[PDB]
Amino acid sequence: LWPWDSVRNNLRSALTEMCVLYDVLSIVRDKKFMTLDPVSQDALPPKQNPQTLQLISKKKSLAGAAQILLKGAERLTKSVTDFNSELLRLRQHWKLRKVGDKILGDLSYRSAGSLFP
Amino acid sequence: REEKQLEASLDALLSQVADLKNSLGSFICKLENEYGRLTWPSVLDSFALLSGQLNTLNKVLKHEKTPLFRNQVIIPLVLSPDRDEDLMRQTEGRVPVFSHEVVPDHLRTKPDPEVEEQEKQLTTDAARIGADAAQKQIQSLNKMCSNLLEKISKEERNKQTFNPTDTNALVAAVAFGKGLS
Amino acid sequence: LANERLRALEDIEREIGAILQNAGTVILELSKEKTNERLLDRQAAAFTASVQHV
Amino acid sequence: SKETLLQSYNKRLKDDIKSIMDNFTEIIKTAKIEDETQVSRATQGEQDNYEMHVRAANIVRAGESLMKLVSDLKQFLILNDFPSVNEAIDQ
């Protein structure tokens, strides 16, 4: 498959790390060949770790929301600025009818008064 | 006590693996077999659901009701030159051969090379004013989001042409002599 | 017989103005200072009720 | 029957009404702030952004679905009317 090539390997990029996570969490759960020890240590942040991440995360969320809104906003403005124009002729010049999914019309003179099967 | 507290998170964390495999293995065969009949909303819906439910479930199993992210010890203890069949039993044939270097490769805690430049940027945007103007900006924007959710919460809340009585009066008025004198 | 196609054009060509209504809402929202908060609120309320009259 | 088609059109119209509100509600529902309890918050913001991106595209495709489903009834209404049908035949 010559298209859709980088998407496949980039999905395996998420596949492999998640497989490693599954394997290590299935070997942590097994008591054999595993050492369990509660190591309760604290890593000091030099900055306000929730607030300094909130400096960028919600700003980028709102900016990317507005950008991906404007991506599809201008796509539909030019997409709407003749199909139904001619469709109003066959209703007036001839007889129109609809059945199933297809539009049809008769040609006999039943409307003009002709008893022909 | 504590070990069950690890287990109740990690078991569902590896249960998310099953959903991720059920998505990607179907995607692998359906991409090769059905490359044509291009339907961008159809794949956009799959991307949207993968972004929605998996990213919420692994986050809710890794960020709450979970052991602390700096607590546990990730330990590799057994590794051999030949293929250790326990891993292919667990991983269902994935990560083959069981090499010597693949066990250090498993703990790939080093990030992407571009993460070095974004850390350089994180040291670069601190050269200008930081946590003094942007702090009050995000405070005012949190209050603005509170105002927006208040707006949403305050915004979240034929003629009788025929008359049977008149018709019944009409059908009875001409029946006999009432309403004429 | 062009009245209903004019109604359909009213349905369609309003949506450009709806896009501009959403844009004028969000640009005034992302502004740090908003003297015309009433304009922002009426833009949001007009976008809410105007899809309804559509 | 005809009433079944009318009910199907009514059901899809109400589904179109529901989808837009469901798209706008979840964008601002996820924007609320919560305190961290052993979270490692470095991964949550990109998740929120990447979930906001598809939710806004849901509004975009909801508008496209409205455009298509209006045109679906456009050809349904055009085949059976009476504004000048009995009038333009004799003119």
Q: Nearest-CA residue of chain A relative to D56?
A: A69
Q: Which helix (H) or strand (E) holds B60?
A: helix B55-63
Integer Cα distance of B119 and B125 in angstroms: 10
Beta carbons of C53 and C34 less than 8 angstroms apart: no
Residues of D with CB under 8 A from a CB of B: 25, 28, 31-33, 36-41, 43-44, 47, 50-51, 53-55, 57-58, 61
The residues that bridge with A99 in the sheet, in sequence order, are A102
For chain C, how far is it from start to end, CA to CA, in angstroms? 21
User: Of B15, B16, B4, whose CA–CA distance to B67 is shortest?
Assistant: B4
- A84-92 long-range contacts, Cβ below 8 Å, gap at least 24? A84/C5, A84/D74, A84/D75, A84/D78, A87/D75, A87/D78, A88/C1, A88/D78, A91/D78, A91/D79, A91/D85, A92/D88
CA B119 to chain centre: 26
How is residue D48 written in tokens? Answer: 């929120």
DSSP state of B51: I
- Amino acid, res. A51: Q
Q: Which helix (H) or strand (E) holds B22?
A: helix B2-33
The residues that bridge with A103 in the sheet, in sequence order, are A98
Would you call B47 and D54 a contact, using CB atoms and an 8 Å cutoff?
yes
- Amino acid, res. B94: R
Alpha helical stretches, state H, B99-133:
102-106, 113-124
Would you call A84 and D49 a contact, using CB atoms and an 8 Å cutoff?
no
Exposure on the CB side of residue B124, measured as CA atoms within 13 A: 6
Beta carbons of D23 and D58 less than 8 angstroms apart: yes
Which runs of E-coded beta strand occur in A59-108? 97-99, 102-104
This entry's atomic model was obtained through cryo-EM
Q: How many CB atoms lie within 10 A of CB D48?
A: 20
Integer Cα distance of B116 and A47 in angstroms: 19
What is the 3-class SS of C15-37, one letter each residue?
HHHHHHHHHHHHHHHHCCCCCCH
Integer Cα distance of C32 and B144 in angstroms: 10
DSSP, collapsed to helix, strand or coil, labels residue A102 as strand
Mutate which of A1, A17, A23 to test chain B, going by most B C-beta atoms within 10 A? A23
Q: Which helix (H) or strand (E) holds C46?
A: helix C37-53
Whether B55 contacts chain A with CB within 8 A: no
Integer Cα distance of D60 and B9 in angstroms: 37
How is residue D84 written in tokens? Answer: 């000048």
DSSP, collapsed to helix, strand or coil, labels residue B80 as coil
- D3-12 long-range contacts, Cβ below 8 Å, gap at least 24? D9/D73, D12/D69
Per-residue b or e along A41-60, where b marks 16 or more CB atoms closer than 10 Å to that residue's CB: eeeeeeeebbebbbbebbbe
DSSP, collapsed to helix, strand or coil, labels residue A97 as strand
Integer Cα distance of C52 and D17 in angstroms: 10
| Torsion angle of the four alpha carbons D89, D86, A96, D91, in this order, in degrees rounded to the nearest 10 | 10
Q: Phi-psi category of A115—alpha, beta or left, where left has phi over 0 and alpha has psi -120 to 50?
A: beta
- Amino acid, res. D6: L
- Amino acid, res. A1: L
User: Of A54, B137, A73, whose CA–CA distance to C25 is shortest?
Assistant: A73
Integer Cα distance of A59 and A64 in angstroms: 9
User: Of D46, B175, B2, B89, whose CA–CA distance to A57 is shortest?
Assistant: D46
Beta carbons of B149 and D32 less than 8 angstroms apart: yes
User: Nearest C-alpha of chain C: how many angstroms from D82?
Assistant: 9
Integer Cα distance of A116 and B133 in angstroms: 88
Alpha helical stretches, state H, chain D:
2-29, 44-77, 85-88
The residues that bridge with A98 in the sheet, in sequence order, are A103
What Cα–Cα distance (Å) separates residue B157 from each residue in C37, C46, C54? 22, 16, 20
Beta carbons of C26 and C37 less than 8 angstroms apart: no
DSSP, collapsed to helix, strand or coil, labels residue D71 as helix
Q: How many CB atoms lie within 10 A of CB B106?
A: 19
User: Of D34, D63, A59, whose CA–CA distance to C29 is shortest?
Assistant: A59
Integer Cα distance of A25 and B25 in angstroms: 22
User: Nearest C-alpha of chain B: how many angstroms from C29?
Assistant: 8
Would you call A66 and C15 a contact, using CB atoms and an 8 Å cutoff?
no
Pick D79's closest partner by Cβ from A65, A73, A98.
Answer: A98
What is the 3-class SS of A3-69, one letter each residue?
CCCHHHHHHHHHHHHHHHHHHHHHHHHCCCCCCCCCCCCCCCCCCCHHHHHHHHHHHHHHHHHHHHH
| Torsion angle of the four alpha carbons A20, A21, A24, A28, in this order, in degrees rounded to the nearest 10 | -170
Integer Cα distance of D75 and D58 in angstroms: 26
> Which residues in chain C are immediately followed by a break of C to N over 2.5 Å?
none
User: Nearest C-alpha of chain C: how many angstroms from D3?
Assistant: 23
Largest CA distance in chain A: 98
Q: Is the dihedral of CA A103, A108, A112, A114 positive or negative?
A: negative
Residues in chain B, total? 181
Whether D60 contacts chain A with CB within 8 A: yes
Whether C29 contacts chain B with CB within 8 A: yes
Integer Cα distance of D54 and D31 in angstroms: 15
Beta carbons of A97 and A105 less than 8 angstroms apart: yes
DSSP, collapsed to helix, strand or coil, labels residue B154 as helix
- Amino acid, res. B132: D
Integer Cα distance of A96 and A87 in angstroms: 10
Q: Which helix (H) or strand (E) holds B70?
A: none
Residues 6+ apart with CB under 8 A from B176: none
Q: Is the dihedral of CA A77, A79, A84, A86 positive or negative?
A: positive
Whether D21 contacts chain A with CB within 8 A: no
Q: How many CB atoms lie within 10 A of CB D8?
A: 10
What Cα–Cα distance (Å) separates residue B56 from each residue in A59, B23, D22, D46? 20, 16, 18, 12
User: Nearest C-alpha of chain C: how many angstroms from D37?
Assistant: 30
Q: Is the dihedral of CA B89, B95, B100, B106 positive or negative?
A: negative
